[PDB]
Design an enzyme around this catalytic site. Sequence first.
Site, PDB file in Angstrom:
ATOM      1  N   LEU A 146     -16.518   9.360 -18.582  1.00  0.00           N
ATOM      2  CA  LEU A 146     -15.639   8.623 -19.484  1.00  0.00           C
ATOM      3  C   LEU A 146     -15.140   7.460 -18.625  1.00  0.00           C
ATOM      4  CD1 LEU A 146     -13.310  11.334 -20.779  1.00  0.00           C
ATOM      5  CD2 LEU A 146     -13.201  10.555 -18.387  1.00  0.00           C
ATOM      6  N   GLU A 153      -4.925  14.385 -23.348  1.00  0.00           N
ATOM      7  CA  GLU A 153      -5.847  13.841 -24.350  1.00  0.00           C
ATOM      8  C   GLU A 153      -6.819  14.984 -24.637  1.00  0.00           C
ATOM      9  OE1 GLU A 153      -8.333  12.464 -27.178  1.00  0.00           O
ATOM     10  OE2 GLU A 153      -8.797  13.018 -25.180  1.00  0.00           O
TER      11      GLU A 153
END
Length: 186
Positions: free
Chosen positions: A22, A30
């Site tokens: 990511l 998250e």
Amino acid sequence: VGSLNCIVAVSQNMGIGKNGDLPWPPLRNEFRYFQRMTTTSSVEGKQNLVIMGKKTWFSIPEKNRPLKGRINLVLSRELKEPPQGAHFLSRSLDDALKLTEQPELANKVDMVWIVGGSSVYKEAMNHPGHLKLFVTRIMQDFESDTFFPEIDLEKYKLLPEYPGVLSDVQEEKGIKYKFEVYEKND
């Protein structure tokens, strides 16, 4: 047996990935929304099915996968096998949703959640019926090699709020993000 739900965290330049990782630093909060969202099973003893692509699968910490309290399927067109930790494999989303009604997976699955990526998302998004995309809107764009495809607004509606989802802009470790929910009913 159920529920097609697309859950994604995107940067502002729409990337969703960088080097099979990511783009942003890891946001543990998250991740917990991620987890709560995809684990919560709604009847007194079945489980949600999670469908993601093989990269994405690999992409998760070897020790995080399989993602528990959840049956996890890798969409894999190309392999004799559901990778170690995988619970199943199917060459297409549709063989993915057919095990639903399959004696295979009929008395198991509650909700179905697409955990990625872009292209499995891309199929889902186009597919009939009722779909719900849950998007974490990361507010600062980062360098990505992959993108989350485009929300056809002729079909997705931005829902103004949603039971269990914060409206407020969130902020962890210096990164602002908002959770936004869309939905369609062809």
